[PDB]
Amino acid sequence: AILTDRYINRGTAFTMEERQKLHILGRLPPVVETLEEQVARVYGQVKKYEKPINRYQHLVSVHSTNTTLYYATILAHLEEMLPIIYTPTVGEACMEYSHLFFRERGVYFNRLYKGQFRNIMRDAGYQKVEVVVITDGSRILGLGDLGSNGIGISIGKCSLYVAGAGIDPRLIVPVILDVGTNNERYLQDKDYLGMREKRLGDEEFYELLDEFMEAASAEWPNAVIQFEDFSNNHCFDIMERYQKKYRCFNDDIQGTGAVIAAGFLNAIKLSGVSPLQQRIVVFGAGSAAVGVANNIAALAARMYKFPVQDLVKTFYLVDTKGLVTTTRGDQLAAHKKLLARTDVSAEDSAKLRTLEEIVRFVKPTTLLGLGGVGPAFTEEIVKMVMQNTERPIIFPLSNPTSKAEVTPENAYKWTNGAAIVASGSPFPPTTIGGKTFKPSQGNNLYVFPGVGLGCALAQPTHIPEELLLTASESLNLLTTEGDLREGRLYPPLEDIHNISANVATDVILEAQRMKIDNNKKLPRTRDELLAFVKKAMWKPVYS
Amino acid sequence: AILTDRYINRGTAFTMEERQKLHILGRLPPVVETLEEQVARVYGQVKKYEKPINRYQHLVSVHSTNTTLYYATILAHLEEMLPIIYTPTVGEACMEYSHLFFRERGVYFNRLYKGQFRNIMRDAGYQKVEVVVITDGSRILGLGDLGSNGIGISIGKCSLYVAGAGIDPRLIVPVILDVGTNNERYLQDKDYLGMREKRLGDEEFYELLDEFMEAASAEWPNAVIQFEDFSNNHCFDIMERYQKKYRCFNDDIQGTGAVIAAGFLNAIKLSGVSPLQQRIVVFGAGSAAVGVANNIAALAARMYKFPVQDLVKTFYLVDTKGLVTTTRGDQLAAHKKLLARTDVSAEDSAKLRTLEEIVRFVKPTTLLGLGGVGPAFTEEIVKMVMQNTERPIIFPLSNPTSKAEVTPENAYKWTNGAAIVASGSPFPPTTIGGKTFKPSQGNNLYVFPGVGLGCALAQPTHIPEELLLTASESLNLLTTEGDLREGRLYPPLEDIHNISANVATDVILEAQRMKIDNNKKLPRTRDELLAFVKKAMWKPVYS
Ligand SMILES: O=C(Nc1cccc(S(=O)(=O)Nc2ccccc2F)c1)c1cnccn1
Ligand SMILES: O=C(Nc1cccc(S(=O)(=O)Nc2ccccc2F)c1)c1cnccn1
């Protein structure tokens, strides 16, 4: 019963004396290993596979037999395992290898079960659930509708809360809300196991998602509900609908802006050009891109008490037409108005269409790549920014690497190593003249696990914007003098347990200051709280 | 508890009413499938993988979650799945992917556990075990010593008793007797989990194997012990040591000779050249090759009551020196003496060295390829056999296909479709002049599962040679007039349940005639017994 329970199984780490006592001597090969030795063996077993999907499949096999060994392997090799266990491999697993997820916990909802959602949750037989990740498979980036196969996205994201913040793997629940699929291949595929129908309209979509939120608030009252990989037609509206009434957040929207804001303020500190002297080209004018700009302005206003209006005036927003201005003659989308230039004439607007002429005119010190249209930050454009600052801040954040505005290698080459670079994706180091440069990766893992652990301990009534901004600031402040002297914008990803403990600590203190915390057992002073949070974390060691 | 038990789990075959009643509605995607629909889906999931090892890995995943669906998929696609689930894929899985077997039942013995073998078996907590497959990883063919990783061979072979003869998958036990490894890579491999030592000498080897046989006879008294993939230094001696005292057999030795003898006697019937008119070149003079010849002579003597001495005189044995004769001047190995020619002069012996001149002199009607040295049956040699018979019998049985004496395609091409061919391996059909030919595969699956089911029902004291010869004859007689009219030498592999039920029936009747049967509940007449055996078989359907 211990060997066959993946939560308590130790495999070859059972000592000979333990195997004798548990009557399992003949169930294992005779070698006895420590957990670090098992992790080294698993890491070799993974790297025997060349393709990410086969590495993923091997890690699923480990997780199904020895959960402690799985999470110990991820924690020892995190940067390398992240592309396998989540984006982009998990989406390819969902799309073409959905059987990899069948044996996992997954809770499936659809219109056939209307009015039974609470019964289904009760039936799942979990105890004090802490984190629930839900998707409908619609995709934040709107590529590759997964329908019911989106359950693998929720499974993968749940796993990152365990690895990142020590959420006990028994207290995470992955959910698929199957409201149909517009995936034409799936709609015709004899082997598609989900609802074989186009996506439900908004009225029915919200009827079912409302029942889900109300059922989860009753049956899983201790949980944070995290929306993952919902399409843009719904993801912003879901948060407007639920943010005050339920304990919920959207990582794609709120996590991303908190992580990019933290890293960007550290790039300002390194750059020699202080926040009010920055001239920031925001290349891309989607709701998400404007959210990131507003999250930067909010964080600088918190950290430095500059008037937020003056920080807004540092942004130069570029949409598909050109520089967004109040004078260029069009009716602006609501989200573009607050960053529109008021200081540019109609005549100058007409001559500010191409990114090259916009950069020549604006004289920016920062280029924020949120454009999703490929390598817009040319050598000529990067060379112009070198005219305005000694340390250009260049953030090519569009995903995947082919949609990205510039490679970190080109950014460093064209500035002779002056560029301060953050990426959505990991890159190898670049060496110029014997000096080494490596971009800072703004991975969402820096924030969501600590928000989850914080909301799990404090049990806040809801997750107001204050808790995300506090997580953003906490992350910024974790970047040490040492980190900064080596050009890093974030604390190191390998230190994610300490990072999450600190983010969670600061989130709790903010919930306590707002009197929204329902858990009154927690310390209310930072040093004693941080020690308490660290002790509360599940660790991937045998105990 | 039903979803997580692979023996009772039905996955998507649970109806909506059943999901309601079992409180599992939210645990599955909403599509309800029949077992045949699930099998079609799994077969597509398998064929999405190009490499055998990745197909194997996918089938392991099915087996770990839904045992009924795994065995239903094998039974629906048997010929195609056999190369994946056993030779040669299972050996490659053992050698390089041994982690595929960690979660499976496996019972591990070694010298560290001397005197505790019975305790280890008791600890395994099985009920009335029927079949135990044991290996030491030494390899029958002596290539790729697997040591402790030989457990995967036992696991794969156990699975074939379930698929082939409906041994209940709860009543099969795979065993590794780890007596060391001569695999130099393993002996230096930090991740090898077995006994890190060269193979024990014979005295210690037999001390431990004796304890195993005695322990299994006490703790698993209802079981057949089947030796799999033991090296030639031990496999013949193990059977001499144990055959009378324990319920045991070796498939490599006894199964192979029973299957080849059955197919060869059907080739004689098709050929127009009756057993006493056959002139059989036995190319290869190993113990195994002489065993196959002796099994043919024994079966013909049983079926036709020709004097066995006259059947022996139909064989012309060829070793590495040439035609084995009493006059060629050397001291013959014991196994070669009984097939040595007494009718060839010393002078003719000296001129009978190359296979070509041996064939020209002997004027054979059959070529039996048991040589293991590549494509010895040349066009010139096949063309000479066409001079001696209208239907050359050509059996290239050396493994793998590169060691084989002739391709079936070349055999049929060079004889314009007259050749009667059996292979160890599967081959595609050959079309000559719009007429189609396909070799008969002498797969060991024809015999061992039915011997296992027979020995499981009758509970004989031991497995004397009479039970193997009866299985051989039963298999021969299952080839219908219809089968024979289409050139088949065996009943079709897809019909393996009916085949095994009939082999088991005949084996039981032989045990009853010898008064070695311990199970007195069984019918003693063939029709009523065969019905009883069919009912006793585990079937891969939901019940
Ligand atoms: O856990 C079992 N066995 C085991 C054997 C060797 C090694 C390990 S391990 O847990 O040390 N490593 C491991 C396990 C999985 C897949 C990849 C792995 F590397 C475990 C078991 C569980 N139930 C039943 C019978 N055995
Ligand atoms: O059995 C479970 N789920 C399941 C989902 C879809 C489909 C099937 S299936 O059993 O229909 N097919 C199948 C299962 C395995 C791997 C390849 C497969 F094709 C099963 C389960 C078991 N425990 C816990 C939660 N779920």
Instruction: Report yes or no: A121 at the B interface, CB cutoff 8 Å.
Output: yes
Distance A59 CA to ligand 1 centre (A): 12
- Residues within 8 A of A (CB atoms), B 450-509 only: none
CA geometry: angle A178, A179, A180, nearest 5 deg: 90
Structure tokens at A512: 């306590």
Amino acid type, A363: K
* Residues from chain B contacting residue A97 (CB–CB below 8 Å): 48
Closest ligand to A29 CA? Answer: 1
Cβ-proximal residues to A474 (8 Å cutoff; 6+ apart), any chain:
A450, A502, A503, A505, A506, A507
- Is the CB of B25 less than 8 angstroms away from the CB of A54? no
Most A CBs within 10 A among B10, B27, B134, hence the mutation to make, goes to B27
Between helices A67-76 and A52-65, what is the axis angle to 10°? 140
Kindly tell me the burial class for residue B399, based on how many C-beta atoms sit within 10 Å of its own C-beta (0-12, 13-18, 19 or more). Answer: middle
Sign of CA dihedral A326, A328, A331, A336: negative
Q: How far apart are CA B60 and CA B146, in angstroms?
A: 20
Query: CA-to-CA distance for A139 and A146, rounded, in angstroms?
Result: 8
Task: Round the CA-based radius of gyration of chain B to a whole number and report it.
Answer: 24
Tokens for A364, please give them.
């920016």
What technique was this entry resolved by?
A: X-ray
CA distance B507 to B304: 19
Question: Is residue A471 a contact partner of residue A503, using CB atoms and an 8 Å limit?
Answer: yes
The single residue listed with the structure tokens 């404007």 is A290
Q: How far apart are CA B446 and CA B254, in angstroms?
A: 12
Residue B110: list chain A partners with CB under 8 A. 30
Comparing CB atoms, the residue among A27, A57, A191 nearest residue B57 is A57
- The count of other CB atoms within 10 Å of the CB of residue B190 is 9
B13-16: long-range contacts at Cβ-Cβ below 8 A with a sequence spacing of 24 or more?
B13/B38, B13/B69, B13/B542, B16/A112
Residues 165-184 of A with CB under 8 A from B: 178
- From the CB of B45, is ligand 2 less than 6 Å away? yes
CA dihedral A115, A117, A118, A121 (to 10 degrees): 160
Asked if residues B448 and B251 have their Cβ atoms less than 8 Å apart, the reply is: yes
A116 touches chain B (CB under 8 A): yes
B194, containing H or E segment: none
B430 in helix, strand or coil?
A: strand
Chain A touched by B32 (CB under 8 Å): no
Q: Whose CA is nearest to atom 8 of ligand 1?
A: A11
CB proximity B50 to A under 8 Å = no
Q: What is the dihedral of CA A151, A153, A157, A158, to 10 degrees?
A: 10
Residue A388 CB contacts under 8 Å (≥ 6 apart), including other chains: A279, A363, A364, A365
**Positive or negative CA dihedral for B431, B436, B439, B443?**
positive
Find tokens 């396909």 and name the residue: B438
CB of B188 within 8 Å of any CB in chain A?
Answer: no
Maximum distance among all alpha carbons in chain B?
86
Q: Which residues pair with B36 in a beta bridge?
A: none
Nearest chain A Cα distance for residue B108, angstroms: 5
Cα B63 from Cα B105, distance rounded (Å): 12
Cα-to-chain-centroid distance, residue A44: 28
Beta bridge partners of B175: B107, B134
Question: Which DSSP category does B200 fall into?
Answer: P
Interface touch A44/B191, C-beta < 8 Å:
yes
Residue B533 CA to residue B455 CA, distance in Å, equals 12
Place of tokens 């193997």: B468
How close are the terminal C-alpha atoms of chain B, in Å? 16
Q: What is the third-level CATH fold of B11-253? A: Rossmann fold (3.40.50)
Asked if B197 contacts B130 with a C-beta cutoff of 8 angstroms, the reply is: no
Measured CA to CA, the distance from residue B160 to residue A55 in angstroms comes to 29
Output the six-digit token pair for B163.
């698929």
CA-based nearest residue to A225, from A233, A240, A214: A214
Tokens of B311: 């059947």
3-state SS, residue B538: coil
> Number of helices (H) and strands (E), helices first, in chain B?
24, 14
The CA distance from B477 to B502, in Å, is: 10
Q: How many Å is the maximal CA-CA distance in chain A?
A: 86
Number of residues that this document lists for chain B:
543
Q: How distant, in Å, are the alpha carbons of A57, A97, B256 from that of A51?
A: 10, 13, 39
Catalytic residue among A71, A126, A157, A242: A157
CB A60 within 8 A of CB A100: yes
Please answer whether residues B248 and B240 qualify as being in contact, where contact means their C-beta atoms are separated by less than 8 angstroms: no
Catalytic residue among B56, B70, B71, B86: B86
Exposed / middle / buried, residue A409 (Cβ in 10 Å: 0-12, 13-18, 19+)? middle
Burial of A483 (0-12, 13-18, 19+ CB in 10 A): middle
Q: Around A25, how many Cα atoms within 13 Å sit in the side-chain half-sphere?
A: 20
Residue pair A431/A386 in contact by the 8 Å Cβ criterion? no
Both structure tokens of A181: 């699929």
Within A429-477, strands assigned E span 430-432, 435-437, 440-441
* Helix and strand element counts for chain A (H, E): 24, 14
CA atoms within 13 A on the CB side of B516: 21
> What is the CA(A11)–ligand 1 centre distance, in A?
5
User: Is there a contact between B28 and A194 (Cβ–Cβ < 8 Å)?
Assistant: no
Q: What's the gap between Cα B41 and its chain centre?
A: 29
Q: Which residue, among A142, A115, A113, A132, has the nearest Cα to A171 in the 3D structure?
A: A132
**CB of A30 within 8 Å of any CB in chain B?**
yes
Q: DSSP class of residue A10? A: -
Rounded CA separation B55/B63 (Å): 12
**Of B434, B470, B473, B431, which Cα lies nearest the Cα of B454?**
B470
Please give, one letter per residue, the 3-state secondary structure of B440-493.
EECCHHHCHHHHHHHHHHHCECCCCHHHHHHHHHHHHHHCCHHHHHCCCCCCCH
Listed residue (B342, B344, B414) closest to B380, CA to CA = B414
- Which member of A28, A57, A106 has the closest CB to residue B108? A28
* Type of residue numbered B369: G
Phi, psi angles (nearest 5°) of residue A427? -135, 150
Q: How, if at all, do strands B315-319 and B322-323 pair?
A: antiparallel
Breaks in chain A at C–N > 2.5 Å: after which residues?
Answer: none
Neighbours of A172 (CB within 10 A): 24
Question: Which amino acid, residue B178?
Answer: D
Distance CA A196, CA A229 (A): 20
CA distance B422 to B255: 16
Nearest CA to ligand 2 atom 12: B11
* Residue to mutate, B37, B41, B66, B542, ligand 2, most ligand atoms under 8 Å from C-beta: B66
User: Which member of A70, A71, A86, A186 is catalytic?
Assistant: A86
Euclidean distance between CA atoms B420 and A233, whole angstroms: 69
Contact indicator for B68, B166 with CB cutoff of 8 Å: no
CA–CA–CA angle A56, A62, A63 (5° rounding)? 85
Task: Determine whether the shortest distance from the Cβ of B69 to ligand 2 is under 6 A.
Answer: yes
Contact between A426 and A84 under an 8 Å Cβ cutoff? The reply is no
Those of residues 423-442 in B touching chain A at CB distance below 8 A are: none
* CA–CA separation, A402 and A421 (whole Å): 17
Q: What strands lie across the sheet with A172-177, from one edge to the other?
A: A107-109, A172-177, A131-135, A224-227, A248-250
- Answer yes or no: B269 catalytic: no
Query: In chain A, what residues touch B31 (CB-CB under 8 Å)?
Result: 192-194, 196
**Residue spans of alpha helices (H) in B220-326:** 232-242, 256-271, 287-304, 308-312
List ligand 1's pocket residues with C-beta within 6 A.
A 3-4, 9, 11-12, 27-29, 38, 42, 45, 61-62, 65-66, 69; B 99, 102-103
HEC assignment per residue over A190-232? CCCCCCCCCCCCHHHHHHHHHHHHHHHHHHCCCCEEEECCCCH
Sheet with strand A315-319: strands edge to edge = A322-323, A315-319, A280-283, A366-369, A393-396, A420-423, A440-441
SS3 A387: helix
- Range A310-333 burial, b when 16+ CB lie within 10 A, else e: ebebbbbbbbeebbbbeebeeebe
Flag whether A182 is marked binding: no
Residue A86: active-site member: yes
The angle subtended at Cα B306 by Cα B477 and Cα B422, nearest 5°, is: 45
CB contact under 8 A, B27 and A99: no
CA-to-CA dists, residue B80 to B35, B89, B493, angstroms: 19, 12, 11
CA-CA distance, B178 to B479, in Å (whole number)? 41
Instruction: Please give the Cα distance from B43 to B453 (Å, whole number).
Output: 28
A229: left (phi over 0), alpha (psi -120 to 50) or beta: left
What pairs with residue A283 in β-bridges? A318, A369
Tell me the three-class secondary structure of A272-298, residue by residue. CCCHHHCCEEEECCCHHHHHHHHHHHH
Residue written as tokens 């035609």?
Answer: B323
In angstroms, the CA B391 to CA B269 distance is 11
Of residues A29, A109, A112, nearest to B193 (C-beta): A29
Intra-chain end-to-end CA distance of chain A, in Å: 16
Q: How far is CA A222 from CA A85, A120, A218, A242, A460, in A?
A: 26, 17, 9, 16, 9
Ligand 2 mean position to B81 CA, how many Å?
20
Name the one residue in this structure whose structure tokens are 């999901």.
B19
Placement of tokens 């130099």 in the chain = B184
